[PDB]
């Protein structure tokens, strides 16, 4: 195939995942659990080759990623006001 499909069984995180990995993948809110997490375990070691950019720089993205996931997630969070 060469590119990745809709939610299907373990895939092997095919270039199009890498691809927008490498430019702009948005591992904040854009992905499920699953992406961030499987790419919360891919660190920048192997997560930048494919972004190969500088570490601090892909880091960058993966600590705006991360920050979102739990940021957009508060959504749930209970009112603003105390008892």
């Given at each position: 195939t060469g590119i990745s499909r809709e939610?299907?069984?373990?895939?092997?995180?095919?270039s199009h995942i890498l691809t927008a990995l490498r430019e702009?993948?948005?591992?904040?809110?854009?992905?499920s659990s699953q992406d961030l997490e499987l790419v919360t375990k891919e660190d920048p070691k192997a997560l930048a080759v494919a972004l190969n950019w500088d570490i601090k720089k892909t880091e960058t993205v993966q600590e705006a990623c991360e920050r979102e996931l739990a940021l957009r997630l508060q959504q749930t969070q209970s009112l603003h006001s105390l008892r």
């Open positions: 939610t299907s069984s373990d895939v092997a995180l095919a702009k993948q948005a591992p904040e809110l854009s992905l």
